[PDB]
Design an enzyme around this catalytic site. Sequence first.
Site, PDB file in Angstrom:
ATOM      1  CG  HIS A 211      -0.655   0.469   2.502  1.00  0.00           C
ATOM      2  ND1 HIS A 211      -0.415  -0.727   3.252  1.00  0.00           N
ATOM      3  CD2 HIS A 211      -0.129   1.400   3.194  1.00  0.00           C
ATOM      4  CE1 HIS A 211       0.070  -0.337   4.531  1.00  0.00           C
ATOM      5  NE2 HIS A 211       0.200   1.103   4.324  1.00  0.00           N
TER       6      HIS A 211
ATOM      7  CB  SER B  19       2.840   1.484   6.112  1.00  0.00           C
ATOM      8  OG  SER B  19       1.581   2.204   6.860  1.00  0.00           O
TER       9      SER B  19
ATOM     10  CG  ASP C  80      -0.117  -3.932   2.865  1.00  0.00           C
ATOM     11  OD1 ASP C  80       0.440  -3.405   1.899  1.00  0.00           O
ATOM     12  OD2 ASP C  80      -0.562  -3.352   3.887  1.00  0.00           O
TER      13      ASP C  80
END
Length: 220
Positions: free
Chosen positions: A45, A176, A89
């Site tokens: 992402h 992230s 992801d």
Amino acid sequence: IIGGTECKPHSRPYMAYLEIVTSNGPSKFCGGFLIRRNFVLTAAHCAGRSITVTLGAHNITEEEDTWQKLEVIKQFRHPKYNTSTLHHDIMLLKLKEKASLTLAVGTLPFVPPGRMCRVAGWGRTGVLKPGSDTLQEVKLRLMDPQACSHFRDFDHNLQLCVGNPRKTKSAFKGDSGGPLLCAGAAQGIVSYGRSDAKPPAVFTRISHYQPWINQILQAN
Ligand SMILES: *[C@@H]1O[C@H](CO)[C@@H](O)[C@H](O)[C@H]1NC(C)=O
Ligand SMILES: O=C1NCc2ccc(Cl)cc21
Ligand SMILES: [Zn+2]
């Protein structure tokens, strides 16, 4: 990183700071980690139109000699990454050249619940706080899969469940892509959690993606 401690500068030499460009908005930011001199692992992402990686950073607002700012030539987002379920992801980034190995920059060489793991990043230090100037790290508890049941798309095979709900410690926005290390070995990648940062959170389980990872590293 919520509820963490500022690291001693450069004690996590594999950490990468990603600035991601998109066509329609200002820059965004993620973490990542150097696994080969010219490959960084991060979250799918965090993909964008283009990415710059900074290795060797501690305080990301003050440039120093440890810094290596590297162009990313190609992004390898996992082909099954799903923007609805958030499955898969994971993303590899190929750097234009191989990084230099210094004291501040090196690769990270490639577990029952109850284990303590740690995760570092430059992300926000609170739900309403800005991204951190410095690298922070937090120790988090690995949980049984049922602790993450309320994430309806969570899958014990593909993901780890990380963080004691009784503590406020957690990864957050901007973290992230950073590695979760258990016993000095990368086991997870920061992926998603609740908007209010109540633990646990969901990390990508690296072991499941290892064949795909090896694949990309051989074809490129
Ligand atoms: C990080 O560096 C900036 C610029 O030098 C400085 O303003 C800021 O206070 C520093 N933060 C820490 C925690 O050292
Ligand atoms: O780990 C996390 N807990 C909440 C959360 C939000 C956003 C991102 Cl990228 C990660 C987390
Ligand atoms: Zn320094």
